[PDB]
Write a protein that binds this ligand. Sequence first.
Ligand SMILES: CC(=O)NCCNc1cccc2c(S(=O)(=O)O)cccc12
Ligand SMILES: CC(=O)NCCNc1cccc2c(S(=O)(=O)O)cccc12
Ligand SMILES: CC(=O)NCCNc1cccc2c(S(=O)(=O)O)cccc12
Ligand SMILES: CC(=O)NCCNc1cccc2c(S(=O)(=O)O)cccc12
Ligand SMILES: CC(=O)NCCNc1cccc2c(S(=O)(=O)O)cccc12
Ligand SMILES: CC(=O)NCCNc1cccc2c(S(=O)(=O)O)cccc12
Ligand SMILES: [Ca+2]
Ligand SMILES: [Ca+2]
Ligand SMILES: [Ca+2]
Ligand SMILES: [Ca+2]
Ligand SMILES: [Ca+2]
Ligand SMILES: [Ca+2]
Ligand SMILES: [Ca+2]
Ligand SMILES: [Ca+2]
Ligand SMILES: [Ca+2]
Ligand SMILES: [Ca+2]
Ligand SMILES: [Ca+2]
Ligand SMILES: [Ca+2]
Ligand SMILES: [Ca+2]
Ligand SMILES: [Ca+2]
Ligand SMILES: [Cu+2]
Ligand SMILES: [Cu+2]
Ligand SMILES: [Cu+2]
Ligand SMILES: [Cu+2]
Ligand SMILES: [Cu+2]
Ligand SMILES: [Cu+2]
Ligand SMILES: [Cu+2]
Ligand SMILES: [Cu+2]
Ligand SMILES: [Cu+2]
Ligand SMILES: [Cu+2]
Ligand SMILES: [Cu+2]
Ligand SMILES: [Cu+2]
Ligand SMILES: [Cu+2]
Ligand SMILES: [Cu+2]
Lengths: 172, 172, 172, 172, 172, 172
Amino acid sequence: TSQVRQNYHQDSEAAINRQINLELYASYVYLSMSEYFDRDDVALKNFACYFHHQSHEEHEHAHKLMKLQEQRGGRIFLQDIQKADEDDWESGLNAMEAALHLEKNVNQSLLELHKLATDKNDPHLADFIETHYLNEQVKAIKELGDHVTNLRKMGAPESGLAEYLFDKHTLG
Amino acid sequence: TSQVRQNYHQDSEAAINRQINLELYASYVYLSMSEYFDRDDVALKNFACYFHHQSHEEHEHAHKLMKLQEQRGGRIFLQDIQKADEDDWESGLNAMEAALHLEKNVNQSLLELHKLATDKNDPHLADFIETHYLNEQVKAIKELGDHVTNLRKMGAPESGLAEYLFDKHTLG
Amino acid sequence: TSQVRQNYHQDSEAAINRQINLELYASYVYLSMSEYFDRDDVALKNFACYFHHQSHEEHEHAHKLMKLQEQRGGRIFLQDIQKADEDDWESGLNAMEAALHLEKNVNQSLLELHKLATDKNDPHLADFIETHYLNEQVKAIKELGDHVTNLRKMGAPESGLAEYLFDKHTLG
Amino acid sequence: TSQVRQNYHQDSEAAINRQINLELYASYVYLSMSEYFDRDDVALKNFACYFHHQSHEEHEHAHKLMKLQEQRGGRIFLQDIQKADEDDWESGLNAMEAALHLEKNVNQSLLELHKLATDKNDPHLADFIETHYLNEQVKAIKELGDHVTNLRKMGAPESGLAEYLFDKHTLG
Amino acid sequence: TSQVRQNYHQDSEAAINRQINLELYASYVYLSMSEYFDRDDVALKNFACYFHHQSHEEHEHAHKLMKLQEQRGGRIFLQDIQKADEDDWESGLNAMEAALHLEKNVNQSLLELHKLATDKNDPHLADFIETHYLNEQVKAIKELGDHVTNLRKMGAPESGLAEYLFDKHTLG
Amino acid sequence: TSQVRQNYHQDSEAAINRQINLELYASYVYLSMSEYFDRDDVALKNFACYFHHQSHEEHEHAHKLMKLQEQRGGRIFLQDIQKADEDDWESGLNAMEAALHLEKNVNQSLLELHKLATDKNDPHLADFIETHYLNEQVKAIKELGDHVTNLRKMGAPESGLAEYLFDKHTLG
Ligand SMILES: CC(=O)NCCNc1cccc2c(S(=O)(=O)O)cccc12
Ligand SMILES: CC(=O)NCCNc1cccc2c(S(=O)(=O)O)cccc12
Ligand SMILES: CC(=O)NCCNc1cccc2c(S(=O)(=O)O)cccc12
Ligand SMILES: CC(=O)NCCNc1cccc2c(S(=O)(=O)O)cccc12
Ligand SMILES: CC(=O)NCCNc1cccc2c(S(=O)(=O)O)cccc12
Ligand SMILES: CC(=O)NCCNc1cccc2c(S(=O)(=O)O)cccc12
Ligand SMILES: [Ca+2]
Ligand SMILES: [Ca+2]
Ligand SMILES: [Ca+2]
Ligand SMILES: [Ca+2]
Ligand SMILES: [Ca+2]
Ligand SMILES: [Ca+2]
Ligand SMILES: [Ca+2]
Ligand SMILES: [Ca+2]
Ligand SMILES: [Ca+2]
Ligand SMILES: [Ca+2]
Ligand SMILES: [Ca+2]
Ligand SMILES: [Ca+2]
Ligand SMILES: [Ca+2]
Ligand SMILES: [Ca+2]
Ligand SMILES: [Cu+2]
Ligand SMILES: [Cu+2]
Ligand SMILES: [Cu+2]
Ligand SMILES: [Cu+2]
Ligand SMILES: [Cu+2]
Ligand SMILES: [Cu+2]
Ligand SMILES: [Cu+2]
Ligand SMILES: [Cu+2]
Ligand SMILES: [Cu+2]
Ligand SMILES: [Cu+2]
Ligand SMILES: [Cu+2]
Ligand SMILES: [Cu+2]
Ligand SMILES: [Cu+2]
Ligand SMILES: [Cu+2]
């Protein structure tokens, strides 16, 4: 038991590990989306850059959690980063829709992590989730929501012109 | 026989000459495309600038080969630069499609030039092709591929609005 | 079959995918090492920074390969990033030794990738491996070799003073 | 018949096309001369640079004409760029003499183009020839004349020292 | 057997050593030429500077090879640097001719080194030779070729004025 | 007999040649030491840089002597640069000890060169040795002495920590 450990329940420790893996999974899904839009038969460069940026963001979210684990005296146990559910993301709108869905899932897990921290009277971990994750999630979900709305109204996916112009004007 | 000649087979020499002529031909095809888009009944200024730039690029590719020929002690024998297969390129998408096709043909010739250099154990010429041509070809083909994809999805050629906006947003 | 595909054998395509996964695995192993040295009962900050840097380097190596796959007209198929063989890296010297070992394994795979490219007469892929990977591997292996040597001579791992000073003077 | 066409006789249009091809031919001859002086058994670097510059100048002369054709509503029809009369230019003086001769021929064609424009009462085309070509030709011919004179007086071609020093002092 | 050694055949190792010695020999020959032109009865200062520069260039070529040897896990075994075939280089043209000859010999050895690397499936060593040596050799040989040509045409060696002016205008 | 020769005895001339060869030998020994410390099983980077610097210093010492030879009207006759007595320098301390020993030997030769110049009443050569060599030798010997002392007191060679820290703090 670590010299620095204080008020850090083994349930929280294990949940942080589960959360670390999910951020890496989120990161990985976005990496897959990113390369998809670089395919010569898709070729939406800004969609690619956007999702490549999201990928590195999710990585930072993982780093912060790993840091937290060692700051608290817990032990990091890493698990396989699972490949995404699809290799082919079909369209710009569909990728946004899958992204929105993924972010809500990460958010649900984070909310249960906060519940766990409240239940265990770990107020340092509660504030840590609120400060670095909860509003970041709310912002991400809303932005993805905004994108899905604009793509739908522009006539995507039955309009290839729509995805082209959105790539230029919103993501460019 | 040149004072500088070393390990330079007469088959390679002649193939370099054939390759020089092809770069000039590629350059010439692009020059034709370039002026086409400046026609008052076509008037796509950025398509014109793009193909005018491609023309001068193919010229540099020719210069590098001519330089190589004299560096190795071979003799340059120049042949007529043949006019392109068409005077009228029909549309933006069609020009891109013809360009992609042309670049693949130049690439095939370059790959056979590399085979010839491997077969003749000319490793200076092999590296010369790899370094200055092979990846340049791969990049060009992919970019042209990307363009053809975006034009097709935007509704070209049955959409004049599509070619207009692509000229503005991708080539502008 | 892609509009851009030329001279790109399905065996090479699949091998690039296998190589992509290995770079990500290498990246992941280094991430694990990085966080290990941030543990309060290890606390070697520069060892941590060094391995964190190696992690992002292996990521770039993966990006370049993914780019190559789509440049050539192949399709990226991503696989799970497997967790490392150990959660606890024991010591500075041991991590270096595991790193050297890992890099030699990545190098062996890259050499077989080059053999495959030679065998398939894909000279663009051969040069791609030589240019961006082979010397990077040779440099990495030698640097890791240098580190293992200095740590061993300093009296590691039976000297905690040795690992402390190496962290300060070589990695600082 | 073009929306922009006005006072532009089909004889002028065809003559512009013939002139375009000649500028490209002139450009091509100069390119041949340029590489000749880079041969290891010739090795006059400044003669090479001078003729390489002349080559690109003749290209601009072609561009201006192509521009003119489309400005006037004519249609560009490109023809093969014929290879030069010689692959081996023998000496510095001989290349200058061939260049002077070529320029006078281009000038004669331009003068007949002006006659055609006068005869057809196309004063825009007449001024276009006067403004951008006639004095450029007069300057070129005189400069080439000056060079041939100096080379002859210096003792070329029976003096290799003469061609060396002229390369250094006039073209350097 | 080194901790870093991988795919590095003992034949390649020994050939690198033989090549190291030759670069040093080349360096030494050039040093001899350099001082020769500083003799009061020769006194061609720029010929001296040119060959002094060549000497240090060949030294760098040796350094790069020594670096390569230790990067690969081979052991450097150094041999005597043999003195040149002549103490008296006779003339500027003769030194250039001896230099051209020497460089072709170094090039032949490098080409056999590449063959050895191909035969041993050492693609890191093959690329190393291509990248850092083969084109450097091609450039050197051609430059020396150019110099010998100009000196011969200027009337060297029966013209002391020729060697004087070449020293001033080409090497100055 | 040279136009510039004055008061320059053939014994001095020959001794300068013998001294030139020794500086080159010293240079060569240091080059060998330099690469030794870059071996992956030695890996003392600053020891390597120090000895690499010593190597180029001994080269300058050779240049100055060659210059002197031609300034005085003597003729340079170069001899083989002999390889060092050892390929493997064993340790940092041992290399310093071998270096100190070598420098004393060069110094002894220089002192006999001065004696020769005094005996031959060549006061230009005497001052040349005093000015450019004798104090440089005294400084070098003392510095090497200082290094050997510090290494011995630090516990080298039975302390690998000692050689590591000396590499960092004195040579870094
Ligand atoms: C096509 C493309 O990739 N465009 C750039 C998109 N933006 C980005 C991508 C990756 C990382 C980024 C980072 S960082 O996480 O590395 O700090 C910071 C800021 C922007 C980033
Ligand atoms: C309408 C139009 O022509 N726009 C400019 C397009 N870009 C270019 C065209 C021609 C040559 C270029 C060159 S260079 O080959 O001359 O160096 C370098 C960079 C850009 C170039
Ligand atoms: C303790 C710690 O992390 N220190 C910084 C170590 N260096 C680095 C770490 C991660 C990424 C780096 C990157 S980049 O891949 O992001 O471009 C570029 C340069 C250095 C990098
Ligand atoms: C050895 C050599 O080539 N030297 C340079 C000679 N000058 C030139 C050559 C080619 C094009 C030039 C151009 S432009 O047409 O590209 O604008 C403008 C100005 C000078 C130019
Ligand atoms: C008369 C005379 O010696 N003139 C200077 C000639 N050029 C040179 C000589 C030696 C070394 C040089 C180096 S370097 O190898 O030291 O980096 C770099 C650049 C030029 C160099
Ligand atoms: C690892 C390594 O090599 N580090 C640099 C060590 N210092 C030096 C090495 C070689 C030549 C030097 C020279 S000069 O002789 O080229 O002028 C001047 C100053 C320093 C020099
Ligand atoms: Ca996000
Ligand atoms: Ca799985
Ligand atoms: Ca191109
Ligand atoms: Ca024809
Ligand atoms: Ca690495
Ligand atoms: Ca697993
Ligand atoms: Ca290569
Ligand atoms: Ca002209
Ligand atoms: Ca013909
Ligand atoms: Ca050289
Ligand atoms: Ca001998
Ligand atoms: Ca010294
Ligand atoms: Ca010997
Ligand atoms: Ca004195
Ligand atoms: Cu990335
Ligand atoms: Cu996240
Ligand atoms: Cu717009
Ligand atoms: Cu142009
Ligand atoms: Cu090309
Ligand atoms: Cu990171
Ligand atoms: Cu890697
Ligand atoms: Cu210290
Ligand atoms: Cu050009
Ligand atoms: Cu012209
Ligand atoms: Cu020197
Ligand atoms: Cu060399
Ligand atoms: Cu050196
Ligand atoms: Cu010395």
